[PDB]
Structures are given as C-alpha cells and as structure tokens.
Assembly symmetry: D3
Homo-oligomer: 299 residues x 6
C-alpha cells in the first residue's frame, strides 16, 4: 500500500514564460522509453513480482524503496512540464478571453499540439515525439541478477537522455529539475551497481559515470552534491524496508565519501498550480461559479 | 511525494493450484483499457495537472487521494496474478528440475505464453489479449467537470470488466480480490458521482449500479459490505487531503447508510511471495548461493 | 452524405451453436489488415481525396460507389461474428443466470477473451490476433493509377484471407457470408482491373483468379453465381455515380458473360439480433424494466 | 446497407491559401481519439451489436441513425483538411512544375510531412500528432446504459477538442466546418442525454454545456442556431428508423425551444475537388492523357 | 548466410552543413511504410518462406538476390541521414563543448527531437513522423503470384515516396542517394514485372513508369542511367543465385536496351563516419582516452 | 554492402510433424523484443551509426561483424518455424485437397491463427503473442560504452528467452537450433564483455553465465561445444573487419580455453523447403503449371 504527501521532492522556481517546445522535449523524461515512467514501472513491477522477499530481503527492500522514490520523480517531471505550459501561474481567474480571437493561434505551429488539444495545456503520458508510454518498456524477468543488470543500464540510459535534454533548454525550471534528478539517478545507478557487486564480485560502480562526464560539471547538479544529496538513500516508508544499509554503504562513486541511509523523506517543496487558462477551459472557461460552490461546501 | 507500506490492502487466500488462463483473464483488470493501471494513471495525472488546487481544494483532495488508493489496487491485482502463476508458493528452494525434461511443456498451449517467456511466471503490464498498457488510456483534459464525468464512466466500465472476469473463473484468490475491488470501485463511483452532484445538480448516484446488478449479489463483495467497507473512504496520507468529507458524506448508494472518512490506511494483509520456480530461473536457477550471500550481509 | 437501410445485403442462416474460436478467426475479415474495414476505409478516403472528380468522373464514380458497398460488408461480417457469439439468438429474455455459478467459464480458455470481457459477446474492431484495426492500413496517395493498382491487390489479398478462413470453419453462417463476399470481391477486383485496362492497356483481368482457384469450386459462392450476382455492380445511390457503366462493361472474368450495372441496392435480408445474454449484461442483466420503459414511450 | 449522395452536409467556402499546420491540427477532429472517426465507429459498431433491436427499438433507431450522420461528418472534416492542403483548388491542370526545383521545399519544415509524402497533399486517417486512428477508440459493451453514458461523454469530449482547434486557426473553411459540427454535436449530446433521462430518471441534459461556454458565443455556430439546426434530428434513411421522435422530443438544452425530427437529409452543398498538384503527382504528374481517355469513354 | 563488405553501394558527397529537417524527411525512405526497411524485410522473409526453391528456382533466385541488394540500400539511406545530422564529419575530436551553454538549443525546435535525444544525432528505425518501423509492413503470403504482385506495387509506391522527398530537399547528399535508388528501384520494379509476365502473360512492365514521370527527368538519376545502371542486376553472392538471367533478360522499360546480369557487387564507395559530436556524447564526451586504449590494443 | 550464401549456418534435422503452438512459441526468438531481429537490427544500426570507425576500429569491426552473423540467425530461426509449420516438407505437389472439406480446421483452435491466415503456414515478423517486431526495440545511442553495455544485456536477456522456449518444446528441430544459438550467444556475450573489459577495466565476463546455468547442461548446446564452436568468432567478410582478434582473444568463459578468430563463414547446411501446402495456396493451389513454366525458362 502507499501514502501520499502533498509536496514535491524539491522546491522548483516559478516559470517566467510559456515554452511549449521545451515542454515537448522534457516529455522524453516523463513518458519516453527512458523516462521516469519507465524507471518507476520497472521497479514497481519487479517489486511486486519479486521471489524470495524474505530470503533476499536486502535486495527486495532496495527495489521496493527505489520504486517509491520514482513516484515522486514522475510527479516532479510533470510539475516541470506543467510549469513550462502555464499561461497564468498562480492566478485563479483570467477574464476577457474570446475564443473567436484565436487565443491558441501560437499552438498551431509548435511541435506538440496534443498538449493544447488533448490536454488543457498540461502534461501527457508520452515522450518527445508524441509516442505514448507503453508497458513493453517494463522488464520483469523474475531473475534477480538479470533484472539488476537491466536496472543499472536503465539508469545510465536515462541519465544520457537527461543530459541531452539539459543541453536543449536553458529554462531554469527545467534545469533545476534535471540537475536534481541527475544526482538522484547517480544514487540509483550506484545502488544497483553495489547490489551487483555483492552478488557477482564484478566492480560495476567502477564503470561510472556513463557517459564519461561528471555530474559536478553541471552547475545545478553540483549544488545538490554540495548539499550531500549524492550520499543519501531516503527510506520512503514509515516502518518498512529497513535493511537498505546492508547494500547502500561504503563509498560514493562521485567523490569517495561514505554514503548514508536517511530515515524518511526529504522536506521538499510546494506543489505547483498552473492557474486558470480560459482558452483551455481549465479548470473551466470561467471558474467563478465553481469557486463559489467550493467555498459553500465549507459552510 | 509518496511513502510505501509493505502490506497488501487485504489478506488474500493462499493459492492451491497454478491456473495460467485464469491469470491471463485477470490481466484485463491490471493492464487492459479499464484495468487498475488506467484508474491509477488517470487520477494520478489529473492530480498533477489539476488547476485550482487551493480554490477547488475538496475536489483536488478527492482525486489526489483516490489516485493513492489505486496504487494499492495495481499491487493487489498483480499479487493475484502472481498467485495464479506460482508453482511453489512460499517455498524458497525447489531442486531437481532439468531443462531438458521440458518442465514448461504445459505453457506451449496456454493463451499467454509471455507470462512464461518474458516474465518469470509473473505479472506483466498488459491486458487479456497481451496488449500492453499504454498512455492513451489516460484522459487529462484540465476541465474539472469533464474529467469527473470521465472518471465516473471509467469506474463503472471497470466494474463491468471485473464482473465479467469474475464470471470466467471460480478461483478463490481471484474472486476474493474481485469481491473487494467491486466494493472499493463502488465507493469511487459514488464519490465521483457525489462530486458531480455538487457541481452540476445532476443526481449521478441515482444511475448506480451499472450494470444493473447489486454488489450484494456477489458473495465475496457482500462479505466486505457486511464488515462496512463500502462506507469507508480511507485518507491515504499522514497529514494532507483533509477536506474529503466535504464531498464524501451522506448516503451510500449500496444501502442508504451514512458514509465516512477514515484517517489512515486499512490494516491490510501480508505481501505475497511466489517462491522459487527453477524452470523460470526465478529468482535464480538454484538460488542457494544467493541466499548465502544475503545471510552474510547481516552477519557483517 | 449517406443514408441507411435497415437490412443486411443478404439473408444469413440462423446460428445453431456458439462458436467462439470461429468468431475469432472471422475477425480477420473484419478488422485485420485485409479485412472489410480496410477495403471500406481505403475506398472511402480515396473517394474523399480524389482529384479530378469531374474530369475523371467514371473513375470517381467507381471508387465512391464501391466504398458504399463496403459499408454493407462491414455490417455483414459483424452480423456473422455476432451470430457465432450469440447465446440465445432472437430471445429477448433469459432468466436464472447467477454470476457466482461461473457462466462464462468456457471463455477462460478460448483464443479471444476480449469478445467476452470488453465486448458483450459481440464483434470488436480487430483481427484474428486481437490486433486493433488501424489507419495505416489505408493507402491514399492521390495518384489514380497507383491507388487503383493498390486496390486491385487489396481485393485479391482479401480474397486469399477469405478462402483461408473458409477452410478453417464449416459453420454455415460463416460459409454463407464468405461465399457471397467471394462473389462480390470478384466483382470489385474485376472492376478495378477493367479500370486499369482502360488507363494503361495492361490486361489486368487476365491475371484473375488469384489464388488460382475459381470461385465456382466453393459451393456457397457457386450458389450466388448461379443467381447471376457476379455480373452485378449495384449503384448504391439515389441519383449519383451514374457513369459506372463506362468501366463496368464487357465480359465477366468468371464465365465470360456480359456484366451489368443495377440501379439501386439488392433486396437484402433482415438484420440480426443476438438476443439477451445475461452473463454479459447485454442489453442489461435483466432487461425487463427497460423493455417496459420502451413500451411506455409508444403509449405516450 | 447504405446509400451515398454526392453532396457535403453543408456548403464550405473556397480556400484562399494552403495552410499545412492548420490542416495538421484539424486532423485531431478526423482521426484522433475524439475525432469524427471515433463517433462514427462507436455508433456504427454499437448499432451492429445492439441486442433487442425490436424490444428497444427507439434506442436502436437513435444510435443507428446518428451513426449514419457521422459518415457525413468524416466526409466534411476530410473536405476541410483537403481544402487547407489544396494548391490549385478547382484547377484541372497546372503545367511547368519541375521536380528538380524543389517544389515541396516548404513541406520539409511543417509539422505533418506525411500529408505530402504518404498522401498526395490530402487527408490521412490520423490525429494531430500523426497517430493513426485505431479500433481501441471504440467502446461497444453490449450494455445499453453503459454505452449511452460513454456516448454522452464522447460527444462532449469531442466538443472540447473542436473548441480548442477552433481557437488555433482563423481559417474560414475550418471555422465554418467547426461551427456547424459544434451545433450537430450539441444535438447528439442532447439526444443521448434525453435517452439516458428516459432510462434512468437522471437529468443528464442539465449538465450541458460542457465545457461551460455556450455555442452561441461562437459566431459560426450561432449562425447555424439562428437557422434552427440545433433543433433538428435528420432521419438519414428512406424508410427506416422512424421512432426517433419518441426520444428526440421536448426542449432543446440550448434555448428551451421544441426539437423536431426532419424526414430526410439536408440539401447540403457541393463536394470539394482540390485540383491538380503536379509535385504530388495527383491525380498524375501531367493528367492530360488521362483526361483524354476519360472523355473517350463517353464516346 | 551472409557476408559483409565495408563499402557503400555508391560514393556519396560530403555534407556541407547539418540539416535536421531534411534528415527527418529522408527517414521516410528508411523506416516508413514504403522505405528500404520494408523492401528489405519483405524480400528477406519471402525468400526464407519460399516454397519450391528448386522447382521454381529462377523466381527464388530473383527474390533472394534482390533482398540482398536491399541490405545495401538501408545502409545507404542510413549513411545519408547520418551525413545530414553530422556536426563535424571526418573530425575525430572536438574540444571545448560545455553542456551548460545549451549546445543542442537548436534541436528544441526541429521536427524530430528523437534524433538528438534517443540517438546521438544519428539514424533511427522510424519514418518521417517518428513512427517506428514495424513487422506488419511485411507481406509474406506463400503464394508466388500474390507476393510478386505485392512486390511490384511496393517498388512503385516506394518510388513515389522517393520522388516526393526529392522535391523537399536540395541537399546534394540526399539527391545523389535518391537519384541512384530511383534507378535501382526501376530495375526492381521491372524485374518483378518481368517475373509476372512470365507467369501470367500480363504485360506488367507496360504500366511503367508509375507515377508517369521518367527517371531521366531527375538529373541525378539520369547520370546513373547514362552509366548503364538501369540495365544491371548485380548477383550479390559468391556462387549462388545464378539463374537470374532467365527472368532478367530482354528490354529495359526505360529505353528499350538489353538488360544484363552483372556477376558480383559494384565497387561502390567508402563508408561514412560522422565524427565526434561532444554534445551528443558520441562516441564519448571526450574520446581521447578511448582512442588511446584502441591504439594500445594494436601493441 | 552485403553478399548472400544459399546455406543455413547449421544443418537442421528434418521435421516429422507439424507443431503449430511450438512454432508460435519459437516466434519469440524471431520477432519478439529479445529475438534475433532485435540482436540483428541493434548491431546493424549501431554499425551504420558508429563514430570513429577508424580511430576505434577494433570495436567497429566487432559490431559490424556480429551484425552480419545475426543475419544468418534470423534465417535459421525462420527455417525452424517453417519446419514446424510444414505439412509436406520437401514434396513439390500434393493433390486432392478440397477447400470445402475444412482442411485448416485444426488452425481454428491454435494460438497463432495469423500463421495460417496472413502467412501461408510460414514465419511472420512477430513474437509469441502476435506482437509485431518494431523499431523501438533498437538502441543506438552513439555512445560506445553505453551501446556495448546494452548489447551485453541484450545477449543475456535473449539467452534467457531461448532457455525458456527450450523448456516448452521437445521438438528436435527447435532444440537443435536453440542449442546452437545458445553457443553462439555465449560467444557474443563474451565478446561484448571482453570489449567492455578493455574499455573500463570491469571484469564483465566474470558475471557469466546469466541465468546461472551452464550451456554444457543443455545436451544440444554441449554437442556443439564438443566440436569447439564456442571458441570461434567467424569473420563474415571477404576482406574487411580484420582486427577482431584484438578483442576476441584470451579465455572462453565456458571452459577457460583459448578463443580464436576464423576467417570466413562455417560450412553450414542446406536451406529448408516446406514443400507444397495446397490449402494455403502456397506456392499455388496446384503449382503444376508454374513448375512447367519454370522448366521452359531453362529450355529456352
Ligand atoms: Mn528517477
Ligand atoms: Mn532512478
Ligand atoms: Mn481500483
Ligand atoms: Mn477505482
Ligand atoms: Mn468487401
Ligand atoms: Mn471489396
Ligand atoms: Mn460528428
Ligand atoms: Mn456526433
Ligand atoms: Mn531499395
Ligand atoms: Mn527495391
Ligand atoms: Mn543471434
Ligand atoms: Mn547474438
Ligand atoms: O529514475
Ligand atoms: O531520475
Ligand atoms: O533517478
Ligand atoms: O479502480
Ligand atoms: O478497483
Ligand atoms: O476501485
Ligand atoms: O472488400
Ligand atoms: O468483400
Ligand atoms: O468485396
Ligand atoms: O460527432
Ligand atoms: O460532430
Ligand atoms: O457531431
Ligand atoms: O527498394
Ligand atoms: O531503393
Ligand atoms: O530499390
Ligand atoms: O543473437
Ligand atoms: O543467437
Ligand atoms: O547469438
């Protein structure tokens, strides 16, 4: 079972302007083959399907816990996309939009028209080409070593996509999110590498980083490393998955320092609200009446 | 952000027999168009994409919270499929399996060969025809009324699929899960109906049940209604989403009794472990050495 | 614009037995790559997209008219599938079905479980592997000769699929439909062949039949040829598409006799009603109340 | 069975210039999830699969007849797309196009290159992202109330897509078509709402409009309402489906006026011919010889 | 079984500048429905599945040999796409690229972002809309006449796509490749047409060309015709498939001259190397160390 | 550019019986996610897309050469499927088949009806659920280390699928092919492991075998190891890719013996011909006339 906390894993800066094509590129990190939907659903199904949950408990705890962190990653990437598509962030009411004045004319010429037609200028479950995420992006073989090898590859392939998207947009909301997730992805790759070392004797973490560029060369990632976040494996559970530290110990591949298990989630930051976009009819064309109904429910 | 508890939402009975084609039908309720992956991902993305999170807070809390419940529903359906596919449930070691003796011969003739080739006799992210779940099963329009109307429909279409699968298998593990999820789906359809009533004045809950058969006629659902679970909207959050009761109030469509918000999750039941299946190499062909490595991690 | 007549293009025999796997194979002829949805949608979009509607009028009339015939072919194939899936054909009410008695147990083991879970034991828009029909099965290049060459191929590939399905089931409902559509497909292949002959001088009709087996060797097709239906290109329009006979003239490839344009549709046969299937909740679990509401609409 | 009339459901204005990206957006209303292919094929298959065709005849007549109207809607949307892609509308012959002069250079940079490579600058069976229409967009459950609830939702979701596309293009051919189909979609949603009211007692039409913007605020839709088209359910059959008026009666949700069944189709307008586009080889590179062959067939 | 020669079927000119949208269009000729993956895989599977390999040997030889030529065609189209995407062709090392300077900013706005995110600015197995090539583009019925009729259609449909893409780009690398493949596709269509003539008596080659524009009107194709390449069916095998000349004989549909079987492959041209693209991390962010490792392997 | 030799990479045994559901499972090894189409197309496109073809020549030669071997692997798997589907292997003519006698009746109930409807009882480009192979199964990142890590994983995942299919069928044609390809896949995984060792210093070959079962425990694989085929990396090129031995050197992970580069392809075995199947119209309903036309081409 799961619980939800109404906070993003980090504070994101507010967007300054809409950037549809940047949002279309960041979609690769949500619903593309190596996006956060893929890391999430791989680890989630592997955790359900895991055989030997007590006999191999440290490895089960690792996969089950990292799966839970990835729920917050899809949330963070979606918030970033929604920030890049928000017309009036934090504003509950915009008046005077006339459909006959062609208020979505700009959207005719952007890469991803579905953001504006199918979504209400919001994230969709797709990648950078409009390809919808699909369940064949999940690998759940039941064999522990094979699944772990897959997962090590998955995290470094996902890092490669993150780096390429970082190089396509200078938007600060996108770059803050990518910088943070580069650091978290390094933790995941190191954790799966340490798991493989323990089972096979092969020094998988010595292969990192892939590609051969250090996270410290990305300014936003370096800030999170200076805060220690490459050391931290957070235990996203009230009482379970306590044997993480049997695998998550020893040196960080980033800088040789000792890694730690943090009990509990980070404090994080506020959730994002894109505000009213009348031309998208979101949350309504004119939501004044709905706001009144909601206020009356409290009375 | 999210937290995880290592418990299923209910206790499942232990499986007595492998039933591959029952597992292949139950996959409709996991990764088909109207399966639990669809209810989960619809409400999850709607909750991310929600505009007016404070100004429309009771409606946001509702969607965000039900999305969280659906995480435990994909977990429960996956455990059920895994139970139907398990050869040696709860047994850590089986010895003497020889690949050349054709130990997976039976799987040549079952509907879903992917369960045995791509999976290790385990759940996959697909429906009853092998079709993989896909993101176009999600509807996230940004318009509150339209999304809620979609969600009311989605829950009753999902109920229709659950009832049809229930009629295809008499396996007690599958029927226990379906009975419980019929009750929970009734709660969700009623909640979205009540939300629509509040916003539009249209008495959507008077349309229930769809199809026109009461949950009380399904014995495994009636068992859970007798314990009161059709009245409960659990708040799956330590501190957030506290305004659920502004919508989840009044009469249950099942029996006219007053519905309630429960703080926190249900007690639940234990997670399921399908045990060793050597022919699937799961968790390994012979996992003895891996078990020894894991034990040494504790000693160190 | 289009009009509808509440009749099938032929009378079908009444089904005597449910045959799920026969229905799953006949789906190839509805929603597979070379099924009737493909012939329909190819000619429909080609007719929309046609350039030179007046200057090339005889060719436009041909494509626009055959597209209209294909609407009745998807209808006929769907009726055949529904006949193979019907539990109580023509019976409005079945009583005493209890979901807990596993009334759909047989469907756990059939090839196509979607017919029973997603459909109400009814046709779906898919082929014989459960693959859903898709728009990339349409070819609409805008080039007349290339489109006609495609269409000639499409009809003979579709014929090949029909013959193979015919060889898989001896069900009389399926074989009657296939026999009739073999004759109609021969007309369409001959028509597109004659069109290509007129434009290129290449004697495309001399390539027929493909495969090299005559329709007269299939008893149900021979029945319809004995009534003359291989000679007839029906004009499915009140007043339009009158220049068909500029292409549809001369000898039939079947038997050398002169072909004819018939104004208007054939007489046809009655539409099919699969009746009540309570386990599928179709049209309702117990439709008595709905039948009463419908009767009261007339009294009012 | 079906019959065909060589007329569009309305007269469309002639296009002034090619607008490829507008055509790419309007494709959402043809082959996207909530396009006219979806309303068509949903009602068509529901009508085939309907159980109790005599016992529930008024409801069968409604679905079977609306399915037939939707055939004219795919035709109208295709004509609109073809108008937006037509280089020389109504011109049978253009001479002097040289392939080596790069006459399709502009198409390199448009959103939908398939319109120009796979089609001959013509409509395709796809949506606004190039996604091909697929049969899983059809819902045919066999349960009357569930199918009708789906269909009510389908029409208001489709209306939402129509409105968003309307806001992306000011092209008069697109706006005339959308204005007309907004009115027809309102009729369909009202008809399915009235059907649900009769079966369940739930006042579904009181939920309209969705989104909460009136069709009268869209100028092209208002013109068709002033002509009475929101009142009309046309019976698209010579002799069948005569019990429509048992459901299609009473007040229109738009303005409270009494609705009517019209016997027979509207008069409509002429079909569209995009003319010769030599660079697309459509209907041929130089069609002069083909035109001569066609003329000789008449002799 | 197969053997490989490290040469392209023709020499391609070097690219002058990156042209992403031209590459995105040329993808139609690689992984679209009528691209070279389709001609390749159709003939390959037909050759595997062929019944009567000795009794119908001339027809088997034809299909099996043309399948082998198509392997070189996917190679040539991929090289063309890679040329259009290459930043520093023939340069093994570029230094001084900083990810934080947004070196892939231009890629945010191009049609195909996957070329830069999923690929390392390289070809992918997809068409002009980002649609991935799929196995349902193969037709392998087992019936010889039906498969040959399909294949004749396939080659002329593919020619139509080649011509339309030619008209979208004036890039010399693309036009050289298309000009050559127009000539080779004419050979294939003529060969399948001659095969059908021999089996059915229907004069299929009299239908060529489709569309009705001669290859001689395309300057790059005319050059290859002046070199005689429309006459040549190359036998791509050391010792097998020697009965080609029983079908590939008689007159060319292009100019009436006698066609010939050439024993063995053409000499061709060098393979293409796009060089280092640091922002794509291809072959590495900084490959100096990898180059040193490779040099030491020789010692 | 490429050349073709009309030989399979090994001699296959002749089939004794049609086994449709075995063929449907073996399809996983052809057109599924981890089938031979995926190993082929991954290495083929990586070889096209390779940057630093001279500066990193040994690694280019490796990928370009293994891609060429994989062409013969799709050929071998297709021949195996065709063997399992062949009615009259090696027989050019069968007479007396009447379509109206339902000669494909058995195919109504098998898993993969497409083999008989869309194919002429022949291989298709799909996996074990009927899913068609697709281009997103290819990974071509341009980064050498990342691509090699992918390829090492791909070979061991493919091995896992081969072992599971081996356990589903005892058919000798399928098991001979699988035994040989287990040995060849071990060579490929070892080669990519050695390449990764050279570039990173990580001892990837020490992870093998995955799963933890040795090829020598599969009798048909052991047969080929006894002949030395696990030591051989064949150079499938007349004159190119000569620097393979800079990586393919040192110990075999199977048995510690020294591995070798062999110039040129193996001798191989004959290609397979499924013969005439009249009910599939393959190569024709009655191919006598076609055989006569072919013979006359030689006389002329
Ligand atoms: Mn992550
Ligand atoms: Mn991660
Ligand atoms: Mn649920
Ligand atoms: Mn629910
Ligand atoms: Mn037809
Ligand atoms: Mn036809
Ligand atoms: Mn409509
Ligand atoms: Mn409508
Ligand atoms: Mn080619
Ligand atoms: Mn070719
Ligand atoms: Mn292989
Ligand atoms: Mn391999
Ligand atoms: O991740
Ligand atoms: O991540
Ligand atoms: O991550
Ligand atoms: O759900
Ligand atoms: O559920
Ligand atoms: O649910
Ligand atoms: O057809
Ligand atoms: O047909
Ligand atoms: O047909
Ligand atoms: O519609
Ligand atoms: O519409
Ligand atoms: O509509
Ligand atoms: O080709
Ligand atoms: O080609
Ligand atoms: O070609
Ligand atoms: O492989
Ligand atoms: O392999
Ligand atoms: O392999």
């Amino acid at each position: 079972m799961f619980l939800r906390i109404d906070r993003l894993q980090i504070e994101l800066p507010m967007p300054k302007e809409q950037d549809p094509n940047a949002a279309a590129a960041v979609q690769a990190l949500l619903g593309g083959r190596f996006g956060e939907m893929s890391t999430l659903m791989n680890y989630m199904y592997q955790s359900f399907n895991f055989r030997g949950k007590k006999a191999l408990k440290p490895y089960y705890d690792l996969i089950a816990n990292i799966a839970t962190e990835e729920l917050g990653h899809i949330e963070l990437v979606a918030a970033t996309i929604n920030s890049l598509l928000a017309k009036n962030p934090g504003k509950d009411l915009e008046e005077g939009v006339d459909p006959a004045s062609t208020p979505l004319g700009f959207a005719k010429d952007v890469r991803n028209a579905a953001h504006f037609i199918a979504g209400g200028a919001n994230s969709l479950v797709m990648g950078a080409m409009g390809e919808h995420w699909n369940g064949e992006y999940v690998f759940t073989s039941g064999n522990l070593i094979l699944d772990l090898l897959h997962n090590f590859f998955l995290e470094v392939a996902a890092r490669t996509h993150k780096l390429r998207v970082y190089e396509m947009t200078d938007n600060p909301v996108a770059r803050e999110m990518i910088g943070y997730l580069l650091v978290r992805g390094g933790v995941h790759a190191a954790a799966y590498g340490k798991a493989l070392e323990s089972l096979t004797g092969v020094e998988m973490t010595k292969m990192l980083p892939i590609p051969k560029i250090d996270n410290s060369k990305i300014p936003e990632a370096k800030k999170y490393m200076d805060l220690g976040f490459h050391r931290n494996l957070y235990r996203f559970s009230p009482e379970d998955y306590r044997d993480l530290g049997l695998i998550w110990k020893g040196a960080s591949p980033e800088d040789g320092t000792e890694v730690v298990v943090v009990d509990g989630p980070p404090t994080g930051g506020p959730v994002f609200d894109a505000g009213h976009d009348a031309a998208e009819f979101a949350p309504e064309f004119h939501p004044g009446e709905l706001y009144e109904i909601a206020k009356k429910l409290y009375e």
